[PDB]
Design a protein. Structure first.
Lengths: 198, 196, 233, 204, 222, 212, 222, 196, 198
C-alpha cells in the first residue's frame, strides 16, 4: 500500500505521504501528491485503490467548498471529518464501495486547536494525536509511542517524523520514493518542500 | 414416494401412501397426499412439499373463480392451470403431481404433469420415488376398464410393493374414488397390504 | 440456464425429385427410464409443412402451441388464408429461428433441435435445421441426435450431392430412411422401435403415416457368440 | 503455460534428389523475454542429423543422451549407426519415459550410407514414429509450417533449389510466430559434402 | 482413426484409414494403423498413437518368443489374453483400443479390446472416431457367410463411410486379408480416393532469392 | 504492445509499434496504435484494442460539441477528465485500456495525461505502457533531456520502440511516429522494424551480439 | 451449465486489389467432429457494392449480417437513397458490434469493396468492434496457415533481388484479379490438406465497378 | 443391465440380456454376460466391463487349480473366491456379479456378490441397472421350486420388462441351465419377448 | 525476486548481486553476499527460493573442490557449468526440485578467455556476453544491447553496469538495498568494495 502518516503537535498538524505511483511492474511517477485541500484550514491525505482514491477525494472537496461559499462560513475539522465518515459509511453498503483510507488534519480557528482525524474505508473514524494507514503503522507506531509529547513544537515534530521515515526506509520492502510533507495551522497550509530538498 | 390414479368402468380412483421423509427420519407418517382442487377434480402430490402444496392452493383458487363465472370446468382445463404454473417455473419448483377428474361426458380421465410441466394424458399414471418398482406389475397386470372393486385390488397390490422396497414410502394406503356417485374415502391399514 | 428432463431423440430427413421426407420415433425418455410412447414429434403445420422436434418435451409442447396460434392468427382478416396468402415452410421457419435465437440471447433457451420440412407454394423443396443456439443450416439430408452420426451417413450414399435430388424416386428415398430407422434402433439406447414417417410431395400433397415399426432384423447370428475369447461352450 | 512453448522454436526437414535439408531458427527465450539468438536445435551423430524442439532443458539433455548412446554403438558394432536404426532408437528412448515425458518434438534426417537413399522422420513426445517422403515440421509455428510446406514443396528438388524452398518456408512461418526467430541456420546434406548456412532475418 | 474387421468363410479381414490427427491439424497424411503381431495375426489400432504401436510391438515380440519355445503356431486368443491382461494392469492409462484378428491351427478369429482391458467378440467390429459411420454400413449390408471378395468389398466400403462423414479420419484405405491354409496379404492402399488436384502455379524461387550471412563445410568422421 | 510519449522543448513525441497477437501467433503487424482523436489531440492504445479505439473516437465527438459551444479549443486536462470519467463509470464491468492523451494548448503548454480503465488519471513527462514498456523505459530514461532537438527527439522515440521490438516477443512490426505542436500534430511516417534494425546496428554500432 | 456459444469452423479470406477486391470463404459447416452441410454460404452481397462475411459462431454471424443489411436499408430511407461509402459502413459495423460489448458476438467479421476513389478496400473486425483497414486478411480456423503464404506471395516477404545479397528487396507489383484468384485457390487447397475443418467447397465474390461477381470451385470432401 | 439366476426343481437357471452400452451408444448388442468358471459353476457379470471380465478370469484360474488337487469344488466355495477379490478391492472395482451353481448334494444354490463384496445366498437374485423395474413382478410372482419350464417362462417375463423400460438393457435373452443333465443354452429373439 | 547481473568484457567477468534479504514484511539484512567461489577462477552467483538457494550453492562448491584436490588440476568454467546444469537437470524431475537460478563466471587459464554461463532452475544453460535472472532483465537488457562491446575494459564495464543499476533503482518497485560487485580474471577473484563505498 501507499504511505500515509500524520501527527498533531502543539498548534498544528503535519502530514506525510509517499510520492511514488506504481502500475504493476513499473513506477509511472515518483512525485505524486496524495493531498487535497478541502478548505483554508482543513487538509486531507489519502491512499487506497487505484481509481477510487482521487475520484472520492475530489468529490468530498467539492461538497465542502460548495458549503463554504453558500454559508460564507468555514466548516470545522470535526464536522468535516464527520461528513466524510458519513459518505464512506454509506459507501460500504452500495453496489460497489470506494476503497479509500484517509487522514484529515485541520485547524479549528474556533478553539485555536489543531485536530487530526483518521478514517478507514469502512467508515471507522477516530480522533488521534498521530496516525497512519495500512502497513505504515507497524514500523512507526512504536517510535512515536516513545518520543511524542503534546507540547512538541512544529519544529520538533518534523524531526520526529524524519525518524519514522528513516525507519520506513530501512525495513520496508517497497521503495516509496520519499514523502511530501505539509503543515496546517492558524495561518493555513504550506508545504515543507525542504524535507524533499534535503 | 408412491402415488397414482387409475381410470375404470365408472370413472377413476387415485390413491397414495402416507409417509413423508426428511432424510431417514419420518416427519409425518399419516399424510393426506391427495389434494382436492374441486368437486370432481382431485390430484395427488409428489416431489417437494411446500411447493406442490402452494401450487394446489392456487390451482384451486383459479377454478373456484372459474365456475363462479364460466360454469363448472372440465378436467383437461384443470390440468392446464396446473402445468402453466409448473412450466413457467420449472426453475424453482420440484413437483411430481398427477391430476385426475371425473366429467359426466368424457367419463373420467388422467393427466400426469412431471418435472418440466410436460403434460400427458394416460389410462393411468404412477409417480413417486416408489413407482420405480411397480413398473413390472402395473404394466403386466393391466386390463382396460375394470370394475370398482376389480381395480381397487390393483391400486392395493401396486401400492403394496411400493412400500415393500422403497423406504421413502409407506404408512397407510389412501384412496379417493371420483364417480357419478361422488367422492368416497378409503384407508387400508398395514397388517393388511403386507399380508398379501 | 436449465436442464432438459423428458427427451425425444433423433429426427432424420431427406429430399427427392418431387419432395421431402422426415421421420422420428415416438418415445419420450426421462433419463434412463422410457416413461412414454404416445408421444408425437411430427407436428405438421398448414397443409404444406411439418416440423420434427427433438429434445426437451415440455419445450416442444410449448412450440406446438405457438405454431397453432401462428395459424389461427394468419387467418385473422385474410380471405386467401388457404390459397395465395397462407403460411409457407419458409415463413414458419424464419419465425421459429427468430424466437429460438431471441431466447438463447436471454440466456433462457428452449432445449431443442428442429427440422422444418415442406414444399414452397411455387413447388420448391425446403429442409432446414435450427437448434437451441439459433444455429441453422440447409442441406440435402438432416438429422438430430444420433441422426447426425448414424443416419446421415446412409442418407448420403443415396444423395451424395445437390446434383442427385432430381434423380431420387419418392420410393427409394423412403426405403432408405426406414433402413436408417432400423440402424437407429440397432444402436441407441434412447430410441423407440415404432415411429411416424411423414412425406410432403408437391403433386400428391402431405402424407402423414403413423405408428409403424422396424421389421426385417438379424439377431440369429447371436446364438454363435459365446463368452468373449476363451469360453468354447 | 504448456511446457512445450515456454522456450519456443521451430524445425523443418525436406527430401530432394539424393539429399535432404534440415533447418531451424535460433531463438531461446523465457515466455516473452528473448534470451539468446545463438541457440541451435540441430545436432549430428556421424552422418545422422537430429533437430529437436520444445523444452530447452530437455533438448540439451537429449542431445547428450544420444551422443552418449551413439558413441557406444559405434564402438561396439564398429560402424556408425544408420538413419533408420537411429529413428527406432530415439523412439524407444522417448517412450521408456511414457509417464513423465521429455517435452520435445524430435526430427531425424539423413542419408543411408548403404542404399544411398534420403531419409526424414518425426516423433511426438511419447515416441510415435512418422516417416514421410516430403517434409517434417515441429514446433510453436507448427501450423505456419504445414501451410508453407503444403505449397512450396516439390518432389525431387535439386540441392540448390531445395535450399531455396526450405529456407523460404522456415523464414516466413517464423515471421508469423511470436516465439520463433532471431536468426536461422539450414543444412544441405548429400552423400558426401555437407553445407551449412546462416540466414538473415528480421530481428524482432 | 476409423477401423473395422469382418470374418468370412476361410479367414478374416480388417481395414483402417490413414490419417493421424493432433488437434484439428493433420500430422501424417499416410499413416498405418495395421500392425503385425505374428505372420497370421494382425491388429488395427485406434486412439492414442504411440501406445497402440508400442503395445502390439511388445506382445508381438513375446509371442514370437512363445511359439519358438513351444514349437507351434501362435494361437490368436493368446495374443488376446496377453494384450488385455497388460491393458488392465494400467487401469486405462495406456489408451489403446484395437481390433485383433488372425488365424491359428484352430480356425479364424476376431476380437476387440478397449483401453481398460475389456474385450468383446462378434463377426464384425468398428473402433475409432468414425465408428458410428462405418457401423451403419455394417448393420445394413451384413449377412452371414460372405465371399472373400464380398467381405473385402464391405470392410473397405465401411472405412470409406468413415473417411467422408468424419473429420477425424480420411485419406486412403489399408487392408490385410488372413486366409486359412494360406499366407497373409498386406494391401497398403487398396484404395486412393483422395489425391490432391494439381496446383495452379509453380512456386519454385529463382536461385539467390534467400539472403545468406555465412557458409561453410562441416565435417563428420575422424 | 509498446507505446510511449514524452514532453520536451519541441512539444510532445509519440511512438508506437504495430504488432497485435492472438496467443502465440501474429494475427497482424499493421495496427494503428495511435487514435487521431482530432487535429490537436492523440490517444495511444494499450490494454483493449476496441475499448481504446471506440471510446477515444467517442471522446473526439465530445471535444467537438464542447468547442462549438464555447467557441474555444478544449484543454487537454478537460478532455482527459471526460475520458477517465466515462471509464470510471464502467469500473467493474471489465473494460481494459492504458492510454496517453497528448495535447499542447496555448495556456497549458504541452501536456500528457496517462489514463486507464482503473480510473487512474496521471499527469506526466514520460510514459510507457505495454509489454515492452520496461525496455522502452531503458533507452528513454538514460537519454532524455528537456532540450532535445526535434530531429533527435524523434530518433529517441524510434530507437526506444526498436529496443522493445527486439526483446519483447509481443512487440514488433513497424514504428509509427507523431510530433505534437501548439498548432496540431504532424505524422512522421511508418518505419518497418525489420529494416530499421539492420540500419541502426550498422550506423550506431549497437546490437553487437547480433550476427548479420 | 448452459453455454451459449459454439464454433462452426470455416475460414474466410479477403484481398484488396489495385481496383477491385475479393472475399472468399469455404462452404463446409461443422459441429465437433461431424458435418452439417457441405454447402452453406458465409459470404453475402449486402447492397451498395459491399460484400460481407462474419465467421465464427454460425448464429451470431447470420445475426450481425441481417442486422447490418437491415441497416443499409434504413440508411437509404433517411438520406435519400444515398450510397453507403464502405468506410462509412465499417464505422457503422463498429457500433453494431460494440453495441454488445458485454455479451459479444463470437465472430470475426470482414467486409470488402471499393473506396471513394475506386481503389479496392478491405476491413477486418475484432469480435467487439476493433476495425482496421487491411489490404489482405485471412480470418477463421486456418488463417494461421494462409497468412504466412500470402505474406510471402502477395507481399513478397523474405524475398530479395538475386546477386545483390540482402541488399535489394524484390519490388511489389500489383496482381490482376486473375492472378489473385489463382493465389486464393492454392491457399485454400493447401489448407484443406492439413486442416480438418476446411474442405468441400470454395465460393468467391469479386467486387468491381460493375457490381458483384461470384465464382465457385470444389474442394476435397475429406 | 439385466441379469439373474433362479433356483428350482432340478437345480438352477441363470439368464441375462445382450446389450452393453457406452453412453447412449450400444458398443455390442449381442454380449455373452454369462461367464463359466467351472463345469457346474457359472456366473452372470454386471457392473463395469473390463473389471468383472478379469475377476472371472482369475476365479476360474483358482478353481481349475483346486479340482486339480482338492477334487471338484462346491458352489459355496466358488462364491468365496469371488468375494475375496471383490472385498479386498472394493476401491478399484465396480462389479455386480451373481454366482450360481449346481451341486449333486445341495441341489442348486444362488449367491449374489454386490458392490462391497457383501455375500448373500438367496432363492434367486436379480442385478443390473434394469432390475429396478422387476421388483414388483419377481417378488409377487414367485413360488418356491418350479419346473424346468414352469420357470423358464419367469426369467422370460422378468427379462421382458427389464428391456421394456431400461434403455441400458436389451438385445436378445440368454439362458444357461445348470442341471444333473448338464449345461444347456437358450436364446429367445426380440419379436418374442416383446410379443407378450 | 533478487537481483543477479553479470557481464563479460575484454579479459574478465563481472557479477552484480543485490544485498537485501527479506522475510515477508521486514528486511532481516541489507548486506547479503549471494556469491560463492567454486575455485580460484570460477565464481557463481545465485537467487531463488528461500532454503533451496544456498543449500545447493554449497553442495556444488563441495563437489568442485573435492574434484580439484583429487585431480590436483582445476576444472574449467565450461566443464563446471556443465556439471551444474546436469544436477539441476536431474533436480527438476525429483520428489522436490531446488528452485535456484545461477550465473557462473570464470577465467579459462587454458584459453586465456573469460566465460560467463547463465543457468535457470530448469536446467536451461546458455553462454552469453551478459545476462540476468528473473525480472532483472527487462530493465537492463536494452541498455546493454546499446552500449556493450567485446573490446571493453574492466574499467569500462563497471561504468556500464553502474548505469543498469541506476535504472533498476529508478523503475523497480522493490528496494534491493544496493549490489555487491566482484571481478574474476587471470589473477583470480577480488571484490570491488568501492561501488558500495561510493
Amino acid at each position: 500500500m501507499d504511505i500515509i502518516l500524520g501527527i498533531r503537535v502543539q498548534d498544528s498538524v503535519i502530514l506525510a505521504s509517499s510520492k511514488a505511483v506504481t502500475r504493476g511492474i513499473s513506477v509511472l511517477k515518483d512525485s505524486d501528491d496524495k493531498t487535497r485541500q478541502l478548505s483554508p484550514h482543513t487538509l486531507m491525505s489519502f491512499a487506497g485503490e487505484a481509481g477510487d482514491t482521487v475520484q472520492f477525494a475530489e468529490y468530498i472537496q467539492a461538497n465542502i467548498q460548495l458549503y463554504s461559499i453558500r454559508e460564507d462560513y468555514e466548516l470545522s475539522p470535526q464536522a468535516v471529518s464527520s461528513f466524510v465518515r458519513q459518505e464512506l459509511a454509506k459507501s460500504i453498503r452500495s453496489r460497489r464501495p470506494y476503497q479509500v483510507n484517509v487522514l484529515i488534519g485541520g485547524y479549528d480557528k474556533k478553539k485555536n486547536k489543531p485536530e487530526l482525524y483518521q478514517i478507514d474505508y469502512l467508515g471507522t473514524k477516530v480522533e488521534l494525536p498521530y496516525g497512519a494507514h495500512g502497513y505504515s503503522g507497524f514500523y512507526t507506531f512504536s517510535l512515536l509511542d516513545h518520543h511524542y509529547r503534546p507540547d512538541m513544537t512544529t519544529e520538533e515534530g518534523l524531526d520526529l517524523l524524519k525518524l519514522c521515515v528513516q525507519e520506513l526506509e530501512k525495513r520496508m520492502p517497497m521503495d516509496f520514493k520519499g514523502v511530501i510533507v505539509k503543515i496546517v495551522d492558524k495561518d493555513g497550509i504550506r508545504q515543507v518542500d525542504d524535507f524533499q530538498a534535503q | 414416494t408412491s402415488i397414482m390414479a387409475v381410470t375404470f368402468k365408472d370413472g377413476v380412483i387415485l390413491g397414495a401412501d402416507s409417509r413423508t421423509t426428511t432424510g431417514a427420519y419420518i416427519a409425518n407418517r399419516v399424510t393426506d397426499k391427495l389434494t382436492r382442487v374441486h368437486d370432481k377434480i382431485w390430484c395427488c402430490r409428489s416431489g417437494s412439499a411446500a411447493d406442490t402444496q402452494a401450487i394446489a392452493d392456487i390451482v384451486q383458487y383459479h377454478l373456484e373463480l372459474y365456475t363462479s363465472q364460466y360454469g363448472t370446468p372440465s378436467t383437461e382445463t384443470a390440468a392446464s392451470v396446473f402445468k402453466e404454473l409448473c412450466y413457467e417455473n420449472k426453475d424453482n419448483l420440484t413437483a411430481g403431481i398427477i391430476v385426475a377428474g371425473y366429467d359426466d361426458k368424457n367419463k373420467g380421465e388422467v393427466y400426469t404433469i412431471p418435472l418440466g410441466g410436460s403434460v400427458h394424458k394416460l389410462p393411468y399414471a404412477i409417480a413417486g420415488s416408489g413407482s420405480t418398482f411397480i413398473y413390472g406389475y402395473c404394466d403386466k397386470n393391466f386390463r382396460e376398464n375394470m370394475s370398482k372393486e376389480e381395480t381397487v385390488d390393483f391400486i392395493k397390490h401396486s401400492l403394496s410393493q411400493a412400500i415393500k422396497w422403497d423406504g421413502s414410502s409407506g404408512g397407510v394406503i389412501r384412496m379417493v374414488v371420483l364417480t357419478a356417485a361422488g367422492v368416497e374415502r378409503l384407508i387400508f391399514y398395514p397388517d393388511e397390504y403386507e399380508q398379501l | 440456464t436449465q436442464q432438459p428432463i423428458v427427451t425425444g431423440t433423433s429426427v432424420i430427413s431427406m429430399k427427392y425429385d418431387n419432395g421431402v421426407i422426415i421421420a422420428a420415433d415416438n418415445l419420450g425418455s426421462y433419463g434412463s427410464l422410457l416413461r412414454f410412447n404416445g408421444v408425437e414429434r411430427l407436428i405438421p403445420v398448414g397443409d404444406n409443412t411439418v416440423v420434427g422436434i427433438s429434445g426437451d418435451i415440455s419445450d416442444m409442447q410449448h412450440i406446438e402451441r405457438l405454431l397453432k396460434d401462428l395459424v389461427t392468427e394468419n387467418a385473422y382478416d385474410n380471405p386467401l388464408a388457404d390459397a395465395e396468402e397462407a403460411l409457407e415452410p419458409s415463413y414458419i421457419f424464419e419465425y421459429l429461428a427468430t424466437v429460438m435465437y431471441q431466447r438463447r440471447s436471454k440466456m433462457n433457451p428452449l432445449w431443442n433441435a428442429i427440422i422444418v420440412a415442406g414444399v414452397q407454394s411455387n413447388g420448391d423443396q425446403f429442409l432446414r435445421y435450427v437448434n437451441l443456439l439459433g444455429v441453422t443450416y440447409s442441406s440435402p439430408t438432416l438429422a438430430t441426435g444420433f441422426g447426425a452420426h448414424m443416419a446421415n451417413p446412409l442418407l448420403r450414399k443415396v444423395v451424395d450431392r445437390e446434383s442427385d435430388i432430381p434423380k431420387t424416386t419418392v420410393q427409394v428415398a423412403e426405403e432408405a430412411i426406414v433402413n436408417a430407422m432400423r440402424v437407429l434402433y440397432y444402436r441407441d439406447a434412447r430410441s423407440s422401435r415404432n415411429f411416424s414417417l411423414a412425406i410432403i410431395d408437391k403433386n400428391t400433397g402431405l402424407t402423414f403415416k403413423k405408428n409403424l415399426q422396424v421389421e426385417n432384423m438379424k439377431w440369429d447370428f447371436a446364438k454363435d457368440i459365446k463368452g468373449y475369447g476363451t469360453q468354447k461352450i | 503455460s504448456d511446457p512445450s512453448s515456454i522456450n519456443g522454436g521451430i524445425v523443418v526437414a525436406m527430401t530432394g534428389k539424393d539429399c535432404v535439408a534440415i533447418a531451424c531458427d535460433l531463438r531461446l527465450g523465457s515466455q516473452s523475454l528473448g534470451v539468446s539468438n545463438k541457440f541451435e536445435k540441430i545436432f549430428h551423430y556421424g552422418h545422422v542429423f537430429l533437430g529437436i524442439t520444445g523444452l530447452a532443458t530437455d533438448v540439451t539433455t537429449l542431445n547428450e543422451m544420444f551422443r552418449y548412446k551413439t558413441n557406444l554403438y559405434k564402438l561396439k558394432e564398429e560402424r556408425a549407426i544408420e538413419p533408420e536404426t537411429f529413428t527406432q532408437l530415439v523412439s524407444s528412448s522417448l517412450y521408456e519415459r511414457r509417464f513423465g515425458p521429455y517435452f520435445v518434438g524430435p526430427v531425424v534426417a539423413g542419408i543411408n550410407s548403404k542404399s544411398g537413399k534420403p531419409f526424414i522422420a518425426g516423433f511426438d513426445l511419447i515416441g510415435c514414429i512418422d516417416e514421410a517422403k516430403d517434409f517434417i515440421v515441429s514446433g510453436t509455428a507448427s501450423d505456419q509450417l504445414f501451410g508453407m510446406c503444403e505449397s512450396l514443396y516439390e518432389p525431387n528438388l535439386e540441392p540448390e533449389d531445395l535450399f531455396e524452398t526450405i529456407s523460404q518456408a522456415l523464414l516466413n512461418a517464423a515471421d508469423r510466430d511470436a516465439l520463433s526467430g532471431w536468426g536461422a541456420v539450414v543444412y544441405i546434406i548429400k552423400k558426401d559434402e555437407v553445407v551449412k548456412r546462416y540466414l538473415k532475418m528480421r530481428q524482432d | 482413426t476409423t477401423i473395422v474387421g469382418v470374418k468370412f468363410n476361410n479367414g478374416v479381414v480388417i481395414a483402417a484409414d490413414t490419417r493421424s490427427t493432433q488437434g484439428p491439424i493433420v500430422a501424417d497424411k499416410n499413416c498405418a494403423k495395421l500392425h503385425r503381431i505374428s505372420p497370421k495375426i494382425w491388429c488395427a489400432g485406434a486412439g492414442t498413437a504411440a501406445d497402440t504401436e508400442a503395445v502390439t510391438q511388445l506382445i508381438g515380440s513375446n509371442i514370437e518368443l512363445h511359439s519358438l519355445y513351444t514349437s507351434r503356431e501362435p494361437r490368436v486368443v493368446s495374443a488376446l489374453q496377453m494384450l488385455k491382461q497388460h491393458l488392465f494392469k494400467y487401469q486405462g492409462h495406456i489408451g489403446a483400443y484395437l481390433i485383433v484378428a488372425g488365424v491359428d491351427p484352430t480356425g479364424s478369429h476376431l476380437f476387440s479390446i478397449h483401453a481398460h482391458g475389456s474385450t468383446d467378440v462378434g463377426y464384425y467390429l468398428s473402433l475409432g472416431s468414425g465408428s458410428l459411420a462405418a457401423m451403419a454400413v455394417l448393420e445394413s449390408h451384413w449377412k452371414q457367410d460372405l465371399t472373400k471378395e464380398e467381405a473385402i468389398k464391405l470392410a473397405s466400403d465401411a472405412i470409406q463411410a468413415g473417411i467422408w462423414n468424419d473429420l477425424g479420419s480420411g485419406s486412403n484405405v489399408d487392408v490385410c486379408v488372413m486366409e486359412i491354409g494360406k499366407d497373409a496379404e498386406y494391401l497398403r492402399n487398396y484404395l486412393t480416393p483422395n489425391v490432391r488436384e494439381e496446383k495452379q502455379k509453380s512456386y519454385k524461387f529463382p536461385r539467390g532469392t534467400t539472403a545468406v550471412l555465412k557458409e561453410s563445410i562441416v565435417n563428420i568422421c575422424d | 504492445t509498446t507505446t510511449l510519449a514524452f514532453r520536451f522543448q519541441g512539444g510532445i513525441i509519440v511512438a508506437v509499434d504495430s504488432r497485435a497477437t492472438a496467443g502465440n501467433w501474429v494475427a497482424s503487424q499493421t495496427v494503428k496504435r495511435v487514435i487521431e482523436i482530432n487535429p490537436f489531440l492523440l490517444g495511444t492504445m494499450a490494454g483493449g484494442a476496441a475499448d481504446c479505439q471506440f471510446w477515444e473516437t467517442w471522446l473526439g465527438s465530445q471535444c467537438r460539441l464542447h468547442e462549438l459551444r464555447e467557441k474555444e479549443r478544449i484543454s487537454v486536462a478537460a478532455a482527459s477528465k471526460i475520458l477517465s470519467n466515462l471509464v470510471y463509470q464502467y469500473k467493474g464491468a471489465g473494460l481494459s485500456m492504458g492510454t496517453m492523451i497528448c495535447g499542447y494548448t496555448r495556456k497549458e503548454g504541452p501536456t500528457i495525461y496517462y489514463v486507464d480503465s482503473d480510473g487512474t488519471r496521471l499527469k506526466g513527462d514520460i510514459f510507457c505502457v505495454g509489454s515492452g514498456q520496461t525496455f522502452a523505459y531503458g533507452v528513454l530514461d538514460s537519454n532524455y533531456k528537456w532540450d532535445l532537438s526535434v530531429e533527435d527527439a524523434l530518433y529517441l522515440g524510434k530507437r526506444s520502440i526498436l529496443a522493445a521490438a527486439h526483446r519483447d516477443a509481443y512487440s514488433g512490426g513497424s514504428v509509427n511516429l507523431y510530433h505534437v505542436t501548439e498548432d496540431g500534430w504532424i505524422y512522421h511516417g511508418n518505419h518497418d522494424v525489420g529494416e530499421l534494425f539492420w540500419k541502426v546496428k550498422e550506423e550506431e554500432g549497437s546490437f553487437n551480439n547480433v550476427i548479420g | 451449465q448452459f453455454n451459449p456459444y459454439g464454433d462452426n469452423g470455416g475460414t474466410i479470406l479477403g484481398i484488396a486489389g489495385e481496383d477491385f477486391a475479393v472475399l472468399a470463404g469455404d462452404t463446409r459447416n461443422i459441429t465437433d467432429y461431424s458435418i452439417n452441410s457441405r454447402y452453406e454460404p458465409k459470404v453475402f452481397d449486402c447492397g451498395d457494392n459491399i460484400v460481407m462475411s462474419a465467421n465464427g459462431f454460425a448464429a451470431d454471424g447470420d445475426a450481425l449480417v441481417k442486422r447490418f443489411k437491415n441497416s443499409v436499408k434504413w440508411y437509404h430511407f433517411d438520406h435519400n437513397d444515398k450510397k453507403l461509402s464502405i468506410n462509412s459502413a465499417a464505422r457503422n459495423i463498429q457500433h453494431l458490434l460494440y453495441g454488445k460489448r458485454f455479451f459479444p458476438y463470437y465472430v470475426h467479421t470482414i467486409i470488402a469493396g471499393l473506396d471513394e476513389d475506386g481503389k479496392g478496400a478491405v476491413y477486418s473486425f475484432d469480435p467487439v468492434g476493433s476495425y482496421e483497414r487491411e489490404q489482405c486478411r485471412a480470418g477463421g480456423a486456418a488463417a494461421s496457415l494462409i497468412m504466412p503464404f500470402l505474406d510471402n506471395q502477395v507481399n513478397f516477404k523474405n524475398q530479395y533481388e538475386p546477386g545483390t545479397n540482402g541488399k535489394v528487396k524484390k519490388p511489389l507489383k500489383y496482381l490482376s484479379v486473375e492472378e489473385v484468384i489463382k493465389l486464393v485457390r492454392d491457399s485454400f487447397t493447401s489448407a484443406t490438406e492439413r486442416h480438418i475443418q476446411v474442405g468441400d467447397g470454395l465460393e468467391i465474390l469479386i467486387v468491381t465497378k460493375d457490381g458483384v461477381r461470384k465464382e465457385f470451385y470444389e474442394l476435397k470432401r475429406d
